[PDB]
Amino acid sequence: TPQLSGEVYGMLDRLEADRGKRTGITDRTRGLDQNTLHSNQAAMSVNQLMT
Amino acid sequence: LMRNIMDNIYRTNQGRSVVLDGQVNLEDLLTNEAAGIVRVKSMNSITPLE
């Protein structure tokens, strides 16, 4: 019988990432830094990149 | 030097539609030459676009 390939997984992952793109652009809506600390490159991310 | 420093502060810190690759007519032409508030291309995942 015919099967549905990994494209279904692909756009399910895309849409699960896109759920908040229309309201909640903030990635994962919360921070998590137990291994990777804050970066220090140029005055520590000025203006939050215009927020 | 100060003007280029301000350019680094201003232009280089602009978010966008966050299209992984996309076609979307260049993401609605960079959200109508503004990139202010638009991300609807197809389903693009999280990309800061620094």
UniProtKB/TrEMBL annotation, chain A:
Q: What is the lineage of its organism?
A: Viruses, Duplodnaviria, Heunggongvirae, Uroviricota, Caudoviricetes
What is the designated name of this protein?
A: ORF.04
Question: What is the organism field in this record?
Answer: Pseudomonas phage PaP3
Which gene is annotated as encoding this protein in its UniProt record?
A: orf4
